[PDB]
């Protein structure tokens with residue numbers, strides 16, 4: 226029955242979503258005071274002692290606004306078609322054909338320590354026997370799977386949440402921001418896993434010679450990835466603001482068509498992709514609202530869809546500007562896409578001003594670093610949280626010290642209301658401490674020493690010498 230607009234978006238029904246969480250999973254590693262400008266867990270609502278801010282619902286409405294903004298322009302249809310053929314073609318020539326996913330495999334693949342979403346909103350593990358969903362979720366899972374096998378449509382219902390994560394302090398103590406998560410319903414997760422699990426698996430296997438890098442290991446795969454990029458003359462590393470909310474469904478639809486066409490049960494996959502990209506029903510608590518545009522997350526094959534969309538858009542811009550055919554562009558370039566993160570290396574003479582304009586024309590908001598700049602060295606180019614570094618031995622991804630120290634101050638634990646509480650006792654995190662030494666080692670012995678000290682100090686409440694970890698971490 227209900228009508229109107231919530232955060233600029235049409236209301237379609239009453240909502241069933243539980244209330245937004247007021248707790249964080251972050252705990253300080255020490256009771257001492259935080260260094261100034263330190264990152265902290267994002268805002269926790271009216272109950273947050275650190276600051277008096279608006280309601281979580283208001284913070285969520287802020288995040289929903291960009292979804293009602295006008296879309297940018299679709300790329301010129303001929304470029305769009307050639308690019309999409311060229312990307313599909315590239316995948317046909319590289320991906321290993323997969324057998325269908327079983328219902329059993331699909332259910333196994335899901336993360337069992339997160340919510341089931343609409344309508345039970347229970348942690349998946351609570352109806353999971355080890356090998357099958359039973360009880361309530363078993364009924365949802367079974368129904369969804371029957372619909373899948375019958376090629377019948379089902380309207381996903383997403384549940385909005387806000388992301389508990391560390392953030393720069395201005396997002397707590399200034400203008401408060403917190404990231405919108407889209408939380409899928411178990412049924413949609415099942416259908417999506419069955420439909421697209423094969424493609425995603427096939428794609429992960431090619432993460433070194435195909436540009437969708439999802440599933441890569443920074444440590445083991447990065448040096449080969451980065452060495453490939455280095456073979457090309459110009460390097461650029463666009464950063465994008467609000468990638469997800471600025472997507473066009475029409476482009477996501479072209480990405481999806483490629484996924485469907487490269488899946489083992491394409492007729493079944495088609496029904497699922499059409500449900501995923503049909504106007505989206507999102508439960509914000511009081512209301513379920515309809516979101517026609519942007520990317521709907523928590524798919525969970527979304528990161529692939531998104532990366533694929535990114536590949537389409539970047540390539541469309543490049544082709545529009547250089548006028549080189551998309552296949553030849555892939556001969557003369559090396560891409561890395563990981564959702565919204567990009568690295569483009571190319572031999573082509575690319576007009577950076579025109580490239581920036583074409584992306585802005587599509588609705589995207591490219592930004593780096595302080596139009597897009599291109600460099601003749603990969604040194605310093607950013608990828609995920611790393612800086613790409615090269616030396617006599619080769620290339621690697623070095624985590625910035627910011628993130629390193631940040632991991633020294635904060636640890637994960639059970640949800641609580643006050644993030645400045647420390648956990649009692651240990652400090653049960655030896656693996657991370659070592660990895661941190663590793664990450665610190667790549668910064669040189671001077672820095673490694675500092676970090677070694679703190680790591681030792683904390684490990685009190687085997688820490689190797691520098692040259693041995695550095696060797697283990699780069700080569701090992």
Ligand SMILES: Cc1nc(/N=N/c2cc(S(=O)(=O)O)c3cc([N+](=O)[O-])cc(S(=O)(=O)O)c3c2)c(COP(=O)(O)O)c(C=O)c1O
Pocket residue numbers: 439440441442443608609610611624632637
């Ligand atoms: C400090 C810390 N780091 C976490 N993971 N961060 C990731 C996590 C991943 S993940 O392998 O996709 O989970 C990262 C992956 C890539 N990658 O190029 O494939 C790169 C990076 S990055 O160091 O360059 O940013 C990745 C960083 C995580 C995520 O761990 P989890 O949810 O898998 O258990 C946690 C949470 O436990 C955490 O406390």
Ligand SMILES: Cc1nc(/N=N/c2cc(S(=O)(=O)O)c3cc([N+](=O)[O-])cc(S(=O)(=O)O)c3c2)c(COP(=O)(O)O)c(C=O)c1O
Pocket residue numbers: 389390391609610628629631632633635636637
């Ligand atoms: C690039 C990349 N990074 C991921 N995790 N990022 C996190 C994620 C976390 S998390 O909030 O514990 O999930 C990080 C936590 C801390 N921390 O000091 O507690 C530090 C860091 S860091 O800035 O040093 O790298 C954390 C980094 C993740 C993990 O994201 P997700 O499991 O929450 O969905 C992925 C997922 O595939 C990913 O692809």
